Each structure stands twice: as C-alpha cells, then as structure tokens.
C-alpha cells in the first residue's frame, strides 16, 4: 500500500532526525531515504562518523559543550584582564612614588643652588673688603717708605 | 496491522524530536517509545523539566540565548580591554613626562656642579694671592723692625 | 483510514523537523500541520525565511557558525591581552630604568651638596684667619704711628 510507504519513510525520517539531535557511533544503524522514497538500511562506518559536522556527537552534546566553552572562555579572559589591571594598578602607584621623589629632588636641588649663589655673593664681598684692606696697608707702607 | 504500529511510532518519534527542538513544559504530553515499539503517553513532571540538559527550553531557544551570550561576552571584554589600553596610554604619557623632567633636573644639576667647581677654583686663587700679599706685608714689617 | 492520517501527519512532522535541523530557502516546500491534523502544502516566502530565528539556516549551520564565532572571539581577545601585557612589560622596564636614573641623580646631588658644605666651611676658616692677619698688621701699624 501507499500508506505502508508513507509510514516507512516517516519512521526512517524521524529516526534520522533523532540521530542528528542525539548523535550516532560507528556500527550504529543509519537509514538513507533516496529521492524515490527508497529506504536503505546501512551500518554507519568510521568515515560517516569522522566526516560529519559534529562527528556523530549530535546537536544536544555539541550545544552542551559549546555552552561549557563560552563559559570557560569568559572565566579565562576575565582572570587575564583582572591580572592586567592589577599590573596597571601597581605601575600607577610606582609612577606616583617616582614623581613624588622627583619633586623632592627638585626641592633639594633648589636649596643647594640658592646656598651656592648665596655663598658666591658672600665670597665676592669678602674678596672686595680684603682687597681694599691690603691696598690701604700697601699705601701706608708706600708712604712711610718715601721720607 | 504492522503499518498501524509503524505509523504510531513515527508520529510519536516525530513529536518527541519536535519537543527536543522547540521545548516542553510541566504538564505537556510526552511519549516514551519502549525498545519493543511500545508508546507510553505521559505528562512531563517538574522532575523531567528540571532534569533535562536545557530544562525544557529546546535547541532553538538555547542556541538563540547562547548566541546572545557569545555576543554580549565579546562587547563586555572589548570594553574592558579598551579601558586597560586607555590606562596604558595615560601611563605612557606620564612616564614620558617624568623622563623629560628627570632629564631637565640632570641638566640643572650639571650646571650647579659646574658653578660650584668654578667657584672652588676662583676661591683657591683668591686665597693664594691673599696669602702672598699678607706674607709680603709681614716681610716689609719684619725687615723695617730690624734696625 | 485513521492510519492514513497518522502516517501523513508523521511524514509532514518529520519533514518540518528536518528543515529545522538542516534549514530551508525561499520557494522550498513547507507543511503546516493544523491543530486538527490538517496538512497544508505551501511554498516558503521571503517573509518566512527573513522572519525565522536562524533565517532558514537550520540548527546545524547556526551551531557550526557559532562554534567559529566562539573560537575567533577567543583568538581575537587573546591577541589583544597579549598586546596589552607587552605594553605593561615595556612600561615596567622603563619605570625601573627611571627609578635607577633617579637614584643616581640623588647620589650626584648628595655629593654636590657635601662639596658645597665643605667649601663653605673652608672659606669661613680662610676668611677668619685673613681677618686676624689684617687686624694684627693694622695693630703693628697703629702702634708704629704712635711715637
Ligand atoms: Cl522527526
């Protein structure tokens, strides 16, 4: 009957859809429905298994695994980014400590420069006063000589 | 008939596959096809729902949600990495500003050191010439005493 | 017969499930099973295709593509994080080089300051001994005048 054929094709089609959802292994029964509604009972080979989009795992297993991958890949990258930010936080503190130390060096350099200028000025006055005193003495001697 | 059985199994198999694709809820009709081709009409419990890979959501819903997760997880991490790179860019500018300021401190220190050394050489000369003059005066006095 | 109906619904149901797994295009035969078990043979429009969860791609194609997306998104972010860490490593070395240079500036400044201080103490001794010698000469002259 025609109803025998429709029922046979439907069962084999339902079977094959089930294997796409729940997977298949090497040796497991697989049906090939020919364009003329012909059912061919075949036992899947290592070829059919290895050369399948999901390699006989089925949509459920693949989606369960992909969900695991997505979740692990987020945990993995979040830890890497938290590690990078930790490194950035330490560099920031060390750069602020360097700038604070540089500001103090600059303060100490200004004090040494000003003490230098003040010393230079004080030596000049003493040199001028000393010159004036030695010149005066020389004059008192040059005058006391000629008599 | 045997065709009655094949058609019944095919419908129930097609039905279940549909529920794996489109999902099921607590109370919704579920068929269990026994290894002897026996169909058992039941009503999915809260147990069947809670203890299912996708918890009665179906492959379509789960894949639509997983696509949302993948896309949001990329937007979330791209913003975190753009934030980290923004910090790195600010640290680079500040570190280049510190190095430029350190180079100027070094230049300022060199000039203070040169000014100090020049002053040191100038005072030594002055000190020497002063010693010479005072020594000469003392001699003119030590000689003028001897009479 | 009732078995004719069950077989025709099963085939159409198995057919649609297959299209949900393997996809459908505009023009491709689609069956709509009415709640009264009525099969309606139609042709999928551009509307049915554009307004479908996966736009007629099917669960297999969508899951294969999503797997590609997940994998590329990890390669893309791992390279961005390796790039950020590369910058962090170069900032660390440059900050350690700045701190080493700042420590040497401090050492050089400490030495200029101590040389300034020693010089300052040496001129004070010289100035004091010079004042004394001049005061003595002035006394020998102030006394030798009084006769
Ligand atoms: Cl099916």
Author numbering:
A (entry chain B), B (entry chain C), C (entry chain A): 28 to 174
Provide the authors' own sentences about this structure as they appear in the paper.
Neisserial adhesin A (NadA) is one of the main vaccine antigens, acts in host cell adhesion, and may influence colonization and invasion. NadA belongs to the OCA (oligomeric coiled-coil adhesin) family, a subgroup of the trimeric autotransporter adhesins (TAA), which generally mediate adhesion of Gram-negative bacteria to target cells or to the extracellular matrix and invasion. Similarly, recombinant NadA was reported to stimulate human monocytes by binding Hsp90 (26, 27). It was recently demonstrated that the NadA3 N-terminal region binds specifically to the endothelial cell receptor LOX-1 (low-density oxidized lipoprotein lectin-like receptor 1). The structure of NadA3 24–170 presents a small globular head region (residues 24 to 85) and a long trimeric coiled-coil motif made of canonical heptad repeats, plus the two novel undecad repeats.
Through a cavity-filling mutagenesis approach on NadA3, we identified the mutations A33I, I38L, and A39V, all of which increased thermostability, with the A33I I38L double mutation conferring a remarkable 17°C Tm increase. Next, we performed structural studies to verify the organization of the most highly stabilized mutant; we crystallized and determined the structure of the NadA3 24–170 A33I I38L double mutant. The structure was refined to a resolution of 2.65 Å, with final Rwork and Rfree values of 20% and 24%. Upon superposition, the mutant structure was confirmed to be essentially identical to that of the native protein, even in the relatively flexible wings, exhibiting a root mean square deviation (RMSD) of 0.23 Å for the pairwise superposition of 144 Cα atoms. Moreover, the residues mutated to I33 and L38 present unchanged backbone positions and more-extensive van der Waals’ interactions mediated by their side chains than the original Ala and Ile residues in the native structure. Therefore, the crystal structure of the double mutant confirmed that improved filling of the cavity with hydrophobic residues had successfully created a stabilized antigen. The halide ion, coordinated by Asn44 side chains and >9 Å away from both mutated residues, was present in the same position and with full occupancy in both structures. The halide in the stabilized mutant presented a lower B factor than in the wild type (44.6 Å2 versus 69.7 Å2), which likely reflects a higher overall stability in the mutant, which has a lower overall B factor than the wild type (66.0 Å2 versus 88.3 Å2). However, some mutations abolished binding to LOX-1; these were A33I, A33I I38L, and Y42A. While the presence of the bulky Ile side chain at position 33 in NadA4 and NadA5 may confer greater thermostability, it may also cause the functional closure of this intermonomer pocket, resulting in the observed loss of binding to LOX-1.
